[PDB]
């Protein structure tokens, strides 16, 4: 149980319920390495079904009930057995009490019963660390997964803009996408579709989206800012981008439920085609062939391979790569077998 619970000392950045939004912490002495880490867990769009969360997944929507501590897992683990990429890192861990994809920047008042502050959650977060040694970091990674994933996407270059206003531009911010990278394609049987669940979010959390997506989409369009393929040229920030290419909350948008017959087998065939087409041009991305939803705070991250690389290593070669391309260290793995699980290393559920 390794990082130590802070509740934020700014106690107007707020969960959805007015509780004060917080961190998980493990310092590393003399690291100047820093990964603070997204917590993912879907979202809500409208008072109804955020009260309904409200009720079932309160921890998602309160720090009332949080734990004192938590055990970090997977990249956030301390030992380098499970962990050979970042273990020996300053951890952090934000936990996901905003229901708004990290995109929020709205206060519980008069005219609105939950607060949606994500936006402000990570920008308080990192503005409390600086004093507890961000100051000294030669590298901010801003990771997540799912939710907090695309919440990378979203924040990244704001984390980057905020440590250059106050003063700290030698802090090299990066960002690790995982499973957060999804497509706006047409649902397999057409009851929100995800599309509209992130326009109506926009309005009802007061979501901001990177400021350089927000000036070609324009108002009224910023939902499209949420989806990678869209967001991720607009972004300035090296960004490394973890996606099965048959995500599990992808199929669940697109009303896709697992003997399979043409019109589906053609249907997820040609969504891990449009899911490796969009990862073309990213340099830096890791996209094995299954079936299956997150990885990177998994304590067995470490397994799965694409061309018979991992991922810690893939995001070892990444660090590399940002000290030409390196003999044997590669950082763009993408699958191109067709089917979930034609990689023999994919997660076994
Ligand atoms: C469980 O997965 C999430 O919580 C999540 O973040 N998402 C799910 C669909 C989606 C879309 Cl379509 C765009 C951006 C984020 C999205
Ligand atoms: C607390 O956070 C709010 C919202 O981000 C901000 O307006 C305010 O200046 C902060 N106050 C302090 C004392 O940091």
């Known amino acids: 149980e390794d990082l130590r619970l802070h509740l934020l000392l700014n106690t107007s950045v707020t969960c959805n319920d007015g509780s004060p939004a917080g961190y998980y912490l493990k310092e590393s002495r003399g690291s100047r390495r820093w990964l603070l880490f997204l917590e993912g867990g879907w979202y809500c769009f409208n008072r109804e079904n955020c009260d309904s969360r409200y009720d079932t997944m309160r921890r998602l929507m309160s720090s009332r009930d949080w734990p004192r501590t938590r055990t970090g897992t997977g990249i956030l683990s301390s030992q380098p057995e499970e962990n050979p990429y970042w273990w020996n890192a300053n951890m952090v861990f934000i936990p996901y009490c905003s229901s708004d994809v990290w995109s929020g920047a709205s206060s519980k008042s008069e005219k609105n019963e939950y607060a949606f502050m994500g936006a402000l959650i990570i920008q308080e977060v990192v503005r409390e660390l600086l004093g507890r040694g961000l100051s000294g970091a030669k590298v901010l990674l801003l990771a997540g997964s799912s939710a907090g994933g695309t919440g990378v996407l979203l924040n990244v270059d704001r984390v980057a803009e905020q440590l250059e206003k106050l003063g700290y531009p030698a802090i090299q911010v990066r960002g690790l996408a995982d499973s957060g990278w999804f497509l706006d394609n047409k649902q397999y049987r057409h009851t929100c579709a995800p599309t509209e669940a992130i326009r109506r979010g926009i309005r009802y959390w007061n979501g901001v989206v990177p400021e350089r997506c927000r000036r070609q989409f324009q108002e009224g369009e910023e939902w499209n800012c949420f989806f990678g393929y869209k967001v991720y040229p607009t972004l300035r920030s090296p960004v490394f981008v973890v996606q099965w290419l048959f ?27 449009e899911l490796r087409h969009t990862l073309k041009d990213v340099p830096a991305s890791f996209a094995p062939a299954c079936l299956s939803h997150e990885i990177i705070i998994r304590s067995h991250w470490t397994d799965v391979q694409v061309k018979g690389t991992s991922l810690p290593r893939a995001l070892h070669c990444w660090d590399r790569s940002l000290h030409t391309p390196l003999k044997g260290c590669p950082v763009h793995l993408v699958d191109s077998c067709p089917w979930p699980h034609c990689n023999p290393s994919c997660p076994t559920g």
């Open 247 to 273: 995500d599990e909350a992808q199929l669940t948008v697109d009303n896709v439920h697992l003997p399979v017959q043409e019109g589906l087998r053609l249907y997820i065939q040609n969504l891990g085609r």
